[PDB]
Design an enzyme around this catalytic site. Sequence first.
Site, mmCIF file in Angstrom:
data_model
loop_
_atom_site.group_PDB
_atom_site.id
_atom_site.type_symbol
_atom_site.label_atom_id
_atom_site.label_comp_id
_atom_site.label_asym_id
_atom_site.label_seq_id
_atom_site.Cartn_x
_atom_site.Cartn_y
_atom_site.Cartn_z
ATOM 1 N N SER A 1 10.016 2.025 6.663
ATOM 2 C CA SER A 1 8.732 1.356 6.790
ATOM 3 C C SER A 1 8.045 1.016 5.467
ATOM 4 O O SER A 1 8.240 1.695 4.457
ATOM 5 C CB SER A 1 7.806 2.226 7.632
ATOM 6 O OG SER A 1 7.014 1.433 8.494
ATOM 7 N N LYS A 2 7.196 -0.024 5.505
ATOM 8 C CA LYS A 2 6.360 -0.497 4.401
ATOM 9 C C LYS A 2 4.997 -0.914 4.977
ATOM 10 O O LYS A 2 4.940 -1.480 6.069
ATOM 11 C CB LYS A 2 7.010 -1.705 3.692
ATOM 12 C CG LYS A 2 8.297 -1.406 2.919
ATOM 13 N N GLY B 1 9.356 6.055 6.221
ATOM 14 C CA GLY B 1 10.691 6.067 6.819
ATOM 15 C C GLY B 1 11.073 4.730 7.425
ATOM 16 O O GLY B 1 10.625 4.411 8.534
ATOM 17 N N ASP C 1 1.161 17.782 13.392
ATOM 18 C CA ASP C 1 1.446 17.650 11.967
ATOM 19 C C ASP C 1 0.272 17.028 11.221
ATOM 20 O O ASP C 1 0.450 16.168 10.362
ATOM 21 C CB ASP C 1 2.783 16.919 11.722
ATOM 22 C CG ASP C 1 3.249 16.943 10.275
ATOM 23 O OD1 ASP C 1 3.124 18.010 9.620
ATOM 24 O OD2 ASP C 1 3.690 15.888 9.782
ATOM 25 N N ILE D 1 0.843 -1.202 0.000
ATOM 26 C CA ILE D 1 0.000 0.000 0.000
ATOM 27 C C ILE D 1 0.884 1.261 0.000
ATOM 28 O O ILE D 1 0.666 2.168 -0.808
ATOM 29 C CB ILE D 1 -1.004 0.023 1.203
ATOM 30 C CG1 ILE D 1 -1.942 -1.201 1.237
ATOM 31 C CG2 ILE D 1 -1.800 1.316 1.212
ATOM 32 C CD1 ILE D 1 -2.705 -1.387 2.605
ATOM 33 N N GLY D 2 1.824 1.322 0.941
ATOM 34 C CA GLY D 2 2.704 2.470 1.106
ATOM 35 C C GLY D 2 4.102 2.132 1.578
ATOM 36 O O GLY D 2 4.389 0.982 1.925
#
Length: 255
Positions: free
Chosen positions: A23-24, A21, A133, A17-18
């Site tokens: 990360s997956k 940093g 953020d 999906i994404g």
Amino acid sequence: FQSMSVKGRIYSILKQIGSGGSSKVFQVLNEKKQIYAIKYVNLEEADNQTLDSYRNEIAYLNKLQQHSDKIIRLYDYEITDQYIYMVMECGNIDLNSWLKKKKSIDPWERKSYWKNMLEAVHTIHQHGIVHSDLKPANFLIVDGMLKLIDFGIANQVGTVNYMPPEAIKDMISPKSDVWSLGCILYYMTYGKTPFQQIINQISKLHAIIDPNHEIEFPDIPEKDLQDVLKCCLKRDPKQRISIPELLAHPYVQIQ
Ligand SMILES: COc1cc(OC2CCN(C)CC2)ccc1Nc1ncc2c(n1)n(C1CCCC1)c(=O)n2C
């Protein structure tokens, strides 16, 4: 077809999906053919403060999911010195991708989404968390519902269009999140963020802090929506509306 193991349970990877940093995020299927999202975090190059930021966000996510259904579900996790695997709820799409794909948004859809964002952000504030953020990429659509996916604790990359004037001056209070949520609602109303037109980042940062730089709020049929926008986008945090006040606003209450 590749697989993963999380706390003895086997998951087959459907697609990625994404990727963030170190990360997956993968879309996966469990043994009972139920769909989940697995967040993989590589801990190889992570230092102690990065690790503590990761552990702290997991603990808050784990605790806060009992308090609101507007917080993404965390079903299970596996954490070693080498990696983190987090078994999570799989959503349809994030709010940023949905907004970029959609031409015009339905006023009813806009309002239910705004209610969800308020409920999720209100929940983290009750626990002493200020995100600081917030942007549409922090929200996920799961069956017509918006869910906050992260708490801003762990270490739309570097976007400045949702940044409160006090965050620019410092370089934070629960009011900082109100400004950011205000920017998201402004985007859902006028199809652009309040300072989107200013291409030059420094000139844009100067506009966000400039009291003389007036934010335009063009007339729309929903006067209550126009009011929320003006109340959220007050440059002085002291003059800015709070989340409890936004929850009693006619815009979310009057049917
Ligand atoms: C159906 O699966 C999706 C597709 C999707 O569409 C994206 C549109 C843009 N392209 C470039 C990538 C897919 C966004 C979120 C999801 N679902 C989802 N479901 C659960 C998610 C999660 N995302 N994410 C990230 C948000 C942005 C990328 C990954 C998570 O961290 N979790 C736990």
